[PDB]
Every structure is written in C-alpha cells, then in structure tokens.
C-alpha cells in the first residue's frame, strides 16, 4: 500500500525553524519536492510527510490528554514506507552504514540557489561517516543536477 | 509499502552459473536492470531481488542451525510484491495461462549484444505455452526496445 499524503505549501516546501535544530528557516523548490511524490525510497520525503502530517493535525484538530496514538496508528502507512526503515534495519544488521534518520546533506548552487533533494547522512560505528568516504555519491548527485539543468 | 532492496553489481546484474540450471554466467546491462527499480509488476525483478538478498545474507551474516525463517519473514515485503503472486493465483483460478516463476525469455541483439528485460514464460496444462501463442507479445517487446534504440 503506497502512501497518499501530499505536501502543502511556489510548489516547494519550507521547513520552519521549529523542525530544525540549530538552524533557521529552510526552503526547497518545486523540482526537489516533486521527487517526493514519485519515488518510494527516500527517507527525507518520509520524514517531511511526517512533519507535514503533524502540523496539519495540530492545526485542524483539537488537543486532549495528548493520547493521539490512535490517529497515527490509523494513518501510519499513508505517510511513510515501512519497508524503507526495514531495509535500513537490514543494512544495520549486516555491518554496513545505514540511514540514521537524524542528519541529511544536499548540494547548493552557489549563485542560482537551486537545491538537490537532501539525502540522509550515513552512520557507522555510532559515528557519522565523513565526506571523504562518500564523495562518489556527491559527485553522482552533482552530475544528476547538471543533467537536470541541461533539460 | 513497496520493495526497497537495491540490486548490487557497469550498472548491470550478472547471474552466476549457480543461479541457473544447465547454463553459464549471464549478464544483463544497465538499461534493463534500471527498469527493476520502478516497475511494480515485474516477476523477474522480484526473483532477482530474492537471489541478491540470498547471496548477500550468505556472504555477510553467519550461518548456524539454518533456522533463517525469522530473517525471511522479517524482510519478505522489502524484496518482492505479494500482489504479483496474488494476480498470478487469480489468473490460474480463471483458467488463464499464468506464471510459476520458473522460465523466462528475452530478446538478444545478435551484433550489439544488448538485451531486454526478461519476461517469464506462461504455462498451461502444466506445460509451457509455445512461442507462436504469444508471438505477438514478443513482437511488441522488440518494438519497445527499438524505440529505446531511437534515443
């Protein structure tokens, strides 16, 4: 069962200062957001949908005893893909860097300001991997960004 | 949810002589394997993911008592699509040729060597359908990759 939650708002999504630690308002354009509605294997998209659902639930509904586990139990599968965290658990088991859901990295254009879709920062031995060990992935992301810019 | 397992390794996938019967090593290019990450209704992709998961589990995790039922039950949904085998079950019920995931066919370019994504061989009366009765299908396949040859 694929998720069906669509992100609110030109066409991008903005993470407010509350959803980020030690950071101010951040914003991502329409191109980056549009990938969240098509791909089933992005952790940032899942967490972004979770944050959007939390915000909408707070605004639209009331509050009472904060025992809202029923609401998330009803709509757990409409926001995230459980097989993604399952795959991360398998990668953790096999002694391989996995997707701790805390940190993310992305590529910023120096002048245009265009931003790629953030990818989660891999961790191993309980410590964050250092970019000398996944520079190839960053180069691949830059190549994909250039190719998208061409069209 | 949907499957999240990604196939290992330019960019293609090679089945060793142990994964096939009465055959040698067989490689498939990037242009065919890349379709396995978006199509939700490809039988060969699901079986190839199963084989890759088995190989990685043998290579990395230890083997003892061979009671790996917990491991496969834990990550069955991250490798295959249950609705595919359900659809095959319904097609078998309705007296229509179905697929038991044993035999596959593909198209070779005699000179170039590029191939298409294998499709599984249908079965009736507990016997394989013969090439005439799905020849049209094969034709379509060729046309498709001919279009892929255009770009």
């Amino acid at each position, epitope marked *: 069962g694929t998720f069906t939650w669509t992100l609110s708002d030109p066409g991008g999504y903005c993470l407010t200062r509350w959803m980020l630690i030690e950071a101010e308002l951040k914003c991502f354009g329409n191109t980056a957001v549009a990938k969240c509605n098509e791909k089933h*294997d992005e952790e940032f998209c899942d967490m972004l949908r979770l944050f959007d659902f939390n915000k909408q639930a707070i605004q639209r509904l009331k509050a009472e005893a904060q025992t809202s586990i029923q609401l998330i139990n009803k709509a757990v599968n409409a926001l995230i893909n459980d097989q993604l965290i399952m795959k991360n658990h398998l990668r953790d088991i096999m002694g391989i860097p996995y997707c701790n859901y805390s940190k993310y990295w992305y590529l910023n254009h120096t002048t245009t300001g265009r931003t790629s879709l953030p990818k989660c920062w*891999l961790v*191993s031995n309980g410590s964050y991997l250092n*970019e*000398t*060990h*996944f*520079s190839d992935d960053i180069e691949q992301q830059a190549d994909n960004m250039i190719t998208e810019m061409l069209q | 949810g949907t499957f999240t397992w990604t196939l290992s390794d330019p960019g293609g996938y090679c089945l060793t002589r142990w994964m096939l019967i009465e055959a040698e090593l067989k490689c498939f290019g990037n242009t065919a394997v890349a379709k396995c990450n978006e199509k939700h209704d490809e039988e060969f992709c699901d079986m190839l993911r199963l084989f890759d998961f088995n190989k990685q589990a043998i290579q990395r995790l230890k083997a003892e008592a061979q009671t790996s039922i917990q491991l496969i039950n834990k990550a069955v949904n991250a490798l295959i699509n249950d609705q595919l085998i359900m659809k095959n079950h319904l097609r078998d019920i309705m007296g229509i040729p179905y697929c038991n995931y044993s035999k596959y066919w593909y198209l070779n370019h005699t000179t170039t060597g590029r191939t298409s994504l294998p499709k599984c061989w249908l079965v009736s009366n507990g016997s394989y359908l013969n090439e005439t009765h799905f020849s049209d299908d094969i034709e379509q396949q060729a046309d498709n990759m001919i279009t892929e040859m255009l770009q």
Partner: antibody, heavy 125, light 104 residues
Framework: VQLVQSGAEVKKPGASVKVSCKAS????????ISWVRQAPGQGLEWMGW????????RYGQRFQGKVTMTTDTSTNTASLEVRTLTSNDTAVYYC?????????????????????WGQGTTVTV | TTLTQSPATLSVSPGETATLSCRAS??????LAWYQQKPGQAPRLLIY???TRATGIPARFSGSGSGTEFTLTISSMQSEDFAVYYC?????????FGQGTRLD
C-alpha cells in the same frame, strides 16, 4: 603515475624523521596515501592512511601520537613525521596510493587496496 | 583481524605450479590482496580482490577462495617469480598484512 619518496636518510635515536612522498601522473585529491613500514628482515606493517581530499586520517592502533601524517595538495606531497626513535624503529617506509572506501544509500561498499608503491626510504638509528 | 600463511616457506624448482594459502581470523568477503616483493624492491600489487588480476600481471598468477580461506596459484613458476608473497585484507580497519612466505 609513480611516487618518489625523496631518497633516504638516517639519524641518531631520539631525533625526528620527516619522510616525504611526492605523487605525479594522476589527480592527487582523488586518492589517499597509506604508509607501510617494513623492518629489516620482517614483513610489512601498516601505519596509517590519510585522505588527500580533506585530510581525514585513520591511524594504527599503536601509532597514534607517535606518528603523524600530513598532506599538501599545492605541491602534491604527503609527509610522515616520527617524533621518537628507538633501536627497533629502523625500517623501510613505503608510500602507497589507495582510493578511499566508498559508501552509498543505494549501493554496497566498495573497498580498495594499495595500487602503486614508491621506492622505500630506509631509516637506521 | 590477524591473518596467517600456512607454508611460511617454499623451496620449489622452476617449471611446476606453486600453491599458497592464506587464513583469515574473521570473515573477509572477497576483499583480499596478494602482493609480491622482489629482493631489495618495493612490493607491487599482484591480485586485488579475491580472484582479479591487476593490470599488466601475467596470467600465471591466479587467486581463489572467499570468506576465511584464500589460495594463490602460479602455473608456470619461473626465475622472475622468486620473491616474497604477502596477503593483505582490506575489509576493515586497521589493514593487516600476512607474515609472508618466501618462494625460493
């Protein structure tokens, strides 16, 4: 493509040794440098690995503090510094080129070995 | 992880094959390297990976094995093949070299 380790030199125990290996024929910032020590009559022994991209260092278990690695991308040079010398520290030091291990979310780890080696630099106390 | 070589020496006449063994402490999936070191020369990479030859290496050398157990086979051992052979694992840090066996 080869690496040159600037000949060799010897000194009395207690001093410091600075061994330099210069890389050429390839892009320096894409490959890190590993250091291997071979005692006279003994086998090879791993010391450490420094990435030329940003300077990230992995040190040996018994070489932290005693041995330091530095890099200089301006002149394509890797440097190895030893502060304390001992009768058993006499050896031959080899500078080798190694690609950093690569990891990705959609993929599997790709690990690398030492591709090319420079001529050894001998140190006797 | 510490890995050891079983023969530790090999007095073999030229002409016939030579077999070298390498045993690993833990599991090392196809992440092995075989180097050769001539007398008074820097080591050079012979085999990278379990069974893959480096560029410019003659087909006489061939690696095999996986997991814990690895082997190296030389078909036509010649005069230029008299060196010291080293087994290294690069599956995890720190990188570990073998004790090395001398082929004379």
């Amino acid at each position: 493509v080869q690496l040159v380790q600037s000949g060799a030199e010897v000194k009395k125990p207690g001093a410091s040794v600075k061994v330099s290996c210069k890389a050429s024929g390839y892009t320096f910032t894409k490959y890190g440098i590993s250091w291997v020590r071979q005692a006279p009559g003994q086998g090879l022994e791993w010391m450490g690995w420094i990435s030329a991209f940003n300077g990230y260092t992995r040190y040996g278990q018994r070489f932290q503090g005693k041995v330091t690695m530095t890099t200089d991308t301006s002149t394509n040079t890797a440097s190895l510094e030893v502060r304390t010398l001992t009768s058993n520290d006499t050896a031959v030091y080899y500078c080798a080129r190694q690609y950093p291990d690569q990891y990705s979310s959609s993929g599997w780890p790709r690990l690398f070995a030492m591709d090319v080696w420079g001529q050894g630099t001998t140190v006797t106390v | 992880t510490t890995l050891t070589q079983s023969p530790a020496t090999l007095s073999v006449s030229p002409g016939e094959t030579a077999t070298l063994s390498c045993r690993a402490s833990q599991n090392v999936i196809n992440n092995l390297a075989w180097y050769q070191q001539k007398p008074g020369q820097a080591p050079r990479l012979l085999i990278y990976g379990a069974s893959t030859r480096a560029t410019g290496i003659p087909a006489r050398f061939s690696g095999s094995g996986s997991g814990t157990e690895f082997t190296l086979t030389i078909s036509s051992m010649q005069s230029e093949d008299f060196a010291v052979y080293y087994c290294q694992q690069y599956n995890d840090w720190p990188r570990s070299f073998g004790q090395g066996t001398r082929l004379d």
